[PDB]
Symmetry: none
Subunit: 175 residues, 6 copies
């Protein structure tokens, strides 16, 4: 095969030069890249990741690393931050909430941790924008069946509760 | 099934930064997008929209919100301006009437509103060129049988009235 | 299908900024476009025109408008100039013969005036380049059996008289 | 069905601005265009000329005119110069020998005249660069069996005689 | 086959202006090229390198010189610097562990030295990043069988130790 | 069967205007051209060269002249510089020796000369750096059997001699 790199690299754009911003940059373009091209085999994830990173030192992956987007995003964290990602999940989540917003930090949160709803849910509930929201969001997530049902319906609920109070993704008033 | 994003960007350009300026940019550039690469289902429209807006998780859509290029546009306007933003919808429409004219202000307004004949009809009738037009246009639309039918035959009737009086699109004379 | 946009756009160039000029510009670059990519169906004209004129939602066409290159140019004229009273058809046509010449002004002239031969034939007669050409043309049109055939063979006969006298499209001498 | 217009436009270049230069510029570039992409039908030859010229010029041809490259080059000469190319054949050939030398002027002179070897040879014999070149070239051409084959091997024989005297393509002395 | 050069040449970028900088630039950018287009044979490595470096008849390789990317990078090194004697292998390697770090310098030193594991292991032990690394790495290599296994397990151990101590490739702490 | 002239010409660039400068320009760019697009038959070599030099009939090769790249470049040298142009071939060569060193000069200087070992050997020996270089290279080349052999091993032996004395490519010291 040959990967359509002309296209994939228009969705994504050019990467950040500060190289401990990279795992979060690749983390939040992954959903888009999967729409524009079906990435099925770990060989193609590795090929795509290595193409879009270009000439950066020590930052090529192996197909061993790139089994899921998570596993890859965790491996590029370990080679930049030095630590494992799940020895500072708290600080990383808080840092994203402040720049990008809750629905972003939720998403990267469950890439880095490894689809651990319990933990990431609890760390986020900390950084929600005001007490009122926290109570609102909680009663919606308590009326699902399982924690498997809650990890699909979490963004759907946050987006409904922010409509009522009139806030804007980054958690500021529209009003 | 490679969505050719590089070509679609060649025609539309880059979307704005200030995400209050995204919902109209998407309505304006819609019939260009659809000429380069023709969409068919909601599925594809989702995959195209998300890929254009890039690595933005906050303004990401789902198939549910994308039956039509209008349903997509409406959903984004409620996330950015909030519901019942009637003073702002007043202001985006008054702006267009001055640059473009009333038949453009009508279609963009009706797109951003979720095809709300009653609201947008009302706003435009305050920005028409002079008392005699308002009255002539209304008498024609009142003869029509229901509100679905008025929304169909509005640009039609506005033209007929503007032609008699000898105005061009921007409501200035050609006699 | 797959419309070769970035090739078509290399060949035509950029559409002019004052949009009153567009309609005559889409006429001159038609036989170039048909070179690069043969436009068969009206659905394909719409797609190509819409992608060229970019994010200008004022000028978007439908299959309904663009059946022939001349139908499409006629519509785009109406929207940039306005619908005229018949008594002013003369003043539109004159203008065009000074830019483009008689064969242009005839064709648009019949589109704008419900394809009526008597009116626009009678108007054009006035603006030909010299007495000789006028009588030269008539005799060829007076051998024809009815006004239906005259309406077809008008361009054909006009070119044959301009050949003989040694005149360019604008009706001046080639030297 | 879709011609490679990107590749052909690299081989030719931009057309010259002064349109009395166009009909010879197209004669020089023809045999290279035949190499890059094969041109078999009139309908193809038409399209390639119409796309190269580009619509700023307004020199559109038809599948009747573009039958053979010489018939196309013939037609464009009339619509710029106003005369027939056979009105002054000497004064065209003498021009092309003063810039590009004998082998260009042989090649366009056969194009304009309609493969009239007997005439074009008789004209160019006058403009050759010195008595012994003339008498040396006319020894070789008199040795070959017929005139069909003389017109084939003419440039093959000319390049030889320029070698043995040490002149370049523009008939100047190399030393 | 024809190779996708325009795509490869958009992922790597322009090669540096000083040609002593070229042989390492090519090592950094190898994995990217393998991403765009998987390079399988020595032939295809040659074709790709020769096209990227363009007009340099100076640095053009053959299939002999490029079996593996590490052969090419060595051959290109010998040209741009010159073959140097044993006592100068010190200043070559120290120069590189400063730019790129131990893993790069080990692989090139083993290549510019005819795989002299005792020499290139000895020199690299002076430029390791702290005494506790020097000692930890030694123990792992020591409990291997012979020098041939030690040569092929070196980079495996280096990285394992660098991981525990939490260093990046350039050999500096990131915690 | 399209020759892709836009890809080739993105790697080589635009050939120089002064027709004396061409033969060496095509020598330098030869390996990069066959990197982008693999030639095989003499036919295709002919077709690519004529496409590049464009609408230039004065420098137009035939398949007879194009067995190899070198055979083309020799023939084009003889059309522009003369037969036995030995003062001229002196200065192209000494020129390249003072920018790019002896090993390029031997390779280019050989193509321009149609692989005339004894002539290009002779020229270069008088630009080598110092008397001790000349004796040693000569002894090593003399130990060879045939004159064909000597031209296969010439660069190899230059670099042995150069590497004892401790010189780089450009005849500069490396101590």
């Amino acid at each position: 095969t040959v990967i359509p790199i002309q296209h994939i690299r228009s969705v994504t754009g050019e990467p950040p030069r500060n190289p401990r911003e990279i795992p979060i940059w690749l983390g939040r373009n992954a959903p888009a890249i999967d729409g524009v091209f079906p990435v099925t085999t770990p060989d193609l994830r590795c090929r795509i990741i290595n193409a879009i990173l270009g000439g950066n030192i020590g930052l090529s992956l192996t197909p061993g690393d790139c089994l899921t987007w998570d596993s890859a995003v965790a491996t590029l964290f370990i080679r930049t931050h030095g630590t494992f990602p799940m020895h500072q999940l708290g600080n990383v989540i808080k840092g994203i909430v402040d720049q990008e917003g809750v629905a972003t930090a939720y998403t990267l949160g469950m890439m880095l941790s490894g689809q651990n709803y319990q933990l990431v849910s609890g760390i986020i509930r900390g950084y929600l924008p005001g007490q009122a929201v926290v109570t609102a969001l909680q009663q919606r997530l308590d009326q699902e069946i399982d924690d498997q049902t809650r990890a699909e319906t979490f963004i759907q609920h946050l987006n409904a509760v922010y409509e009522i109070l009139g806030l804007n993704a980054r958690g500021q008033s529209i009003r």
